[PDB]
Design a protein around this ligand. Structure first.
Ligand SMILES: C[C@@H](O)[C@H](NC(=O)CP(=O)(O)OC[C@H]1O[C@@H](n2cnc3c(N)ncnc32)[C@H](O)[C@@H]1O)C(=O)O
Ligand SMILES: Nc1ncnc2c1ncn2[C@@H]1O[C@H](COP(=O)(O)O)[C@@H](O)[C@H]1O
Ligand code: NA
Ligand code: NA
Ligand code: NI
Ligand code: NI
Ligand SMILES: [Zn+2]
Lengths: 342, 229
C-alpha cells in the first residue's frame, strides 16, 4: 500500500509517498523563507499564492523520484487543518480532485497528528502508551497518547507557542524570520549562566505553559546590556536554556502524572539540538526512552502526512467529494483507531 | 472535441461541457459553499453528458480575476483534475466570460466588464468582439478606482454594454462618461460562456501543461508594509 501525502498548512509545501512495506519512497519540499523574510512573518495571502505555484510540480517530482505512476497510488492524503485557511485550501482542493481523477480514496489529515506520528518514520518507533510534547510555531501541548485517536490533552500554552516565542526573541536579536534555528546557532556561541531568564509556570504544580514573559525578559536584557556579538549570544543562550528547562520540567511532570516510560517530542521546535540532548539525558536517568524524528521531519513536511494518511486510511477516515478545511481542529476530536504498523 | 469548463471566481459555481456540438451546463449561486459543491458538480456533468475525464481533450478554468480564495479553488480543482487525467489546461478570463455571456443573451459586441474587487476598486475590462467571434481587449484588464474607470471611459465612444458586480456596487460608474450604456444582463461569469473562448484557444494551440496553469489576480499589493530596510 502507497499513500501520496500533501502538506500546505503554513509556509511550506511538503509532498511525500509512503509504502506500508518499503517505507518512504519520495519526499519533496519547498520552503517560502525568502517570500516572508521581508515582512518578518507569514503573510497568508503570499503563502496561499506560493502553494499554487509549488503543489503540482512537487507532486510531479515525487512521482519521478519514486518511479511511480498513478496506478501505484492507493490513496491521496492532505492536511485539512489546523493551519492557515488559505494555505490549507490549496493542498486540499488539489488533493481531493487528484484523488477523484485518479479514482482513489481521499484522506483529510490532522497536521498535529502528523507531527505526533513523525517518530514512527524512524527505526525503533514508540509503543503505546507515551507522553507527547507537540512543540511547533502554532502549538505547545502535552498529550497522554494511549493509541491512535486516543489523545488526552494534559497541558497547553495559555499564550505564545514555543515556536512563536523563539521567533519573537530572534527578531529582537536582529535575526531574520523565522529566527528559531538562527537563535539556536547564536546561542551555541554563548556563556552558560551569564544571564538568567525565568522558567515560567514551574513555581506551582501543573502542566500548562507560558512563554510571552520570556520575550519581555529578553527585550529588558537587550536594552540594559551591550550591543556586541558576545552579549547577544549570552542572551540567546539564556533564552534557549529557559525554554528547554521549562519544556523538560513540564515533560517530567507529565511522565510522573501518567506513569509512562516513553516521551515523544515533535513539531518544529523538536528540531532544537539542546532540547533533543536534554530530553534524551532526562529519559536515560528515568530509565525510559525518548523518541524524535530526523530534524527535517520535525518542521512541516509531507512525510508525516503520507504516514498519518496511511494510518487514517486503514482506520477508515475517507472523505466524500466535499472539500473542507479546519483552521482550528482539536487533537481530542480525532476518533479512536487501530495502529497497523508492520 | 471534448472540453470541460470550471469556474468558482465569484459567488457563482459553474461547470460546462462541450461534447462537440453538444453543450451540457450547470450554474448555481454558491456563497460559502464552493468547496462542497464543485466536485459533485464536475461528477454530475460528466455523468449527464456520458463523457469520462480521460476522453476530455482540455480543461478550461476560471483564471480570474475575482475573489483570491475563489480563483484558487478553481485553479486547485482544475490542476488536480488535469494532473490526474493528464489533460492540457486553458486559462479563461472571468471578465471575457461575461463579455461572451452578454453576446449569448442579447448580441452585445462592445462590453465594459466590471467586477467588485473590494477595497473600493473594480476589476475592469473593455471587450470588443470582431466578425470571427474573437474578443479584443485582454490588454485593458486592470484593478481600478472608479475615478480611473471614468478616465478610461473618457477615451472611448459609442454604445457599450455593462456587465458584472462593479456596476451593481457603483451604479453611477458611467455617469458623465459621454458613452451610451445599456445593461448587459450579466452579473456573474458562467462556465457555459468559457467553452467558445476555450474552443478557439485549443484550436490555436493556446493550451498549457498543468504545471504552467496560472491565476490572474490583477491586485498584487496584498501584503502589509515591508520591514524597515
Ligand atoms: C501550520 C500549523 O499547524 C503549524 N505549523 C508550523 O508552525 C510550522 P513548524 O515547522 O511545525 O514549526 C516551525 C517552528 O519551529 C521553530 N524551529 C524550527 N527549528 C528550530 C530549532 N532548531 N530551534 C528552535 N526552534 C526551531 C521555528 O522557529 C518555528 O517557529 C503548527 O505545527 O503548529
Ligand atoms: N474556510 C473555507 N472553507 C471552504 N471554502 C471557503 C473557505 N473560505 C472561503 N471559502 C470559499 O471562498 C469563497 C470566496 O471567499 P471570500 O474571498 O472570503 O469572499 C467563499 O464564498 C467560500 O465558498
Ligand atoms: Na503492490
Ligand atoms: Na470519469
Ligand atoms: Ni459526494
Ligand atoms: Ni492498537
Ligand atoms: Zn507544523
Amino acid at each position: 500500500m502507497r499513500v501520496l501525502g500533501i502538506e500546505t498548512s503554513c509556509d511550506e509545501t511538503g509532498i511525500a509517498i509512503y509504502d506500508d512495506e518499503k517505507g518512504l519512497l519520495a519526499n519533496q519540499l519547498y520552503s517560502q523563507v525568502k517570500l516572508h523574510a521581508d515582512y518578518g512573518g507569514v503573510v497568508p495571502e503570499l503563502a496561499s499564492r506560493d502553494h499554487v505555484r509549488k503543489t503540482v510540480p512537487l507532486i510531479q517530482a515525487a512521482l519521478k523520484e519514486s518511479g511511480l505512476t498513478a496506478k501505484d497510488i492507493d490513496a491521496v492524503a492532505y492536511t485539512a487543518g489546523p493551519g492557515l485557511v488559505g494555505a490549507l485550501l490549496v493542498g486540499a482542493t488539489v488533493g481531493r480532485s487528484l484523488a477523484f481523477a485518479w479514482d482513489v480514496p481521499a484522506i483529510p489529515v490532522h497536521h498535529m497528528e502528523g507531527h505526533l506520528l513523525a517518530p514512527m518514520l524512524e527505526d525503533n518507533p514508540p509503543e503505546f502508551p507515551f507522553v507527547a510534547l507537540l512543540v511547533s510555531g502554532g502549538h505547545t501541548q502535552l498529550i497522554s497518547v494511549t493509541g491512535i485517536g486516543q489523545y488526552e490533552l494534559l497541558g497547553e500554552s495559555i499564550d505564545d507557542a514555543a515556536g512563536e516565542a523563539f521567533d519573537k526573541t530572534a527578531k529582537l536579536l536582529g535575526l531574520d524570520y523565522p529566527g528559531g534555528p538562527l537563535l539556536s546557532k547564536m546561542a551555541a556561541q554563548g556563556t552558560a549562566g551569564r544571564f538568567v531568564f525565568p522558567r515560567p509556570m514551574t513555581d506551582r504544580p501543573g502542566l500548562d505553559f507560558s512563554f510571552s514573559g520570556l520575550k519581555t525578559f529578553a527585550a529588558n536584557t537587550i536594552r540594559d546590556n551591550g550591543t556586541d556579538d558576545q552579549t547577544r549570544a549570552d542572551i540567546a543562550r539564556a533564552f534557549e536554556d529557559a525554554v528547554v528547562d521549562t519544556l523538560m520540567i513540564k515533560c517530567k511532570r507529565a511522565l510522573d502524572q501518567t506513569g509512562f516510560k516513553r516521551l515523544v517530542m515533535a513539531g518544529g521546535v523538536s528540531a532544537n539540538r539542546t532540547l533533543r540532548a536534554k530530553l534524551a539525558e532526562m529519559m536515560k536517568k528515568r530509565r525510559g526512552e525518548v523518541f524524535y524524528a530526523r530534524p527535517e521531519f520535525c518542521t512541516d513536511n509531507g512525510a508525516m502526512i503520507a504516514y498519518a494518511g496511511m494510518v487514517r486510511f486503514k482506520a477508515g477516515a475517507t472523505a466524500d467529494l466535499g472539500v473542507s478545511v479546519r483552521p482550528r481542529w482539536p487533537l481530542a476530536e480525532l476518533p479512536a483507531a487501530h495502529h497497523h504498523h508492520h | 472535441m471534448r472540453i470541460l469548463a470550471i469556474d468558482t471566481a465569484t459567488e457563482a459555481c459553474s461547470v460546462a461541457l462541450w461534447n462537440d456540438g453538444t453543450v451540457n451546463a450547470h450554474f448555481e449561486l454558491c456563497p460559502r459553499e464552493h468547496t462542497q459543491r464543485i466536485l459533485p458538480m464536475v461528477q454530475d456533468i460528466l455523468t449527464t453528458s456520458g463523457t469520462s475525464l480521460t476522453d476530455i481533450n482540455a480543461l478550461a478554468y476560471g483564471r480570474g480575476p475575482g475573489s483570491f480564495t475563489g480563483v484558487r479553488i478553481g485553479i486547485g480543482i482544475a490542476q488536480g483534475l488535469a494532473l490526474g487525467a493528464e489533460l492540457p489546461m486553458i486559462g479563461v478570463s472571468t471578465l471575457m466570460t461575461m463579455a461572451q455571456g452578454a453576446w449569448r443573451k442579447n448580441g452585445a459586441t462592445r462590453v465594459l466588464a466590471a467586477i467588485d474587487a473590494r477595497m473600493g476598486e473594480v476589476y475592469w475590462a473593455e471587450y470588443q468582439r470582431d466578425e470571427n467571434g474573437i474578443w479584443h481587449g485582454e490588454e485593458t484588464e486592470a484593478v481600478l478606482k472608479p475615478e480611473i474607470v471614468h478616465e478610461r471611459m473618457q477615451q472611448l465612444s459609442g454604445e457599450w454594454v455593462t456587465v458584472g458586480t462593479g456596476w451593481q456596487a457603483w451604479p453611477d460608474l458611467g455617469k458623465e462618461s459621454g458613452l451610451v450604456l445599456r445593461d448587459g444582463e450579466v452579473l456573474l461569469p458562467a462556465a457555459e460562456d468559457m467553452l467558445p473562448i476555450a474552443c478557439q484557444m485549443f484550436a490555436e494551440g493556446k493550451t498549457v501543461a498543468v504545471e504552467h496553469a496560472e491565476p490572474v489576480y490583477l491586485r498584487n499589493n496584498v501584503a502589509w508594509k515591508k520591514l524597515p530596510g
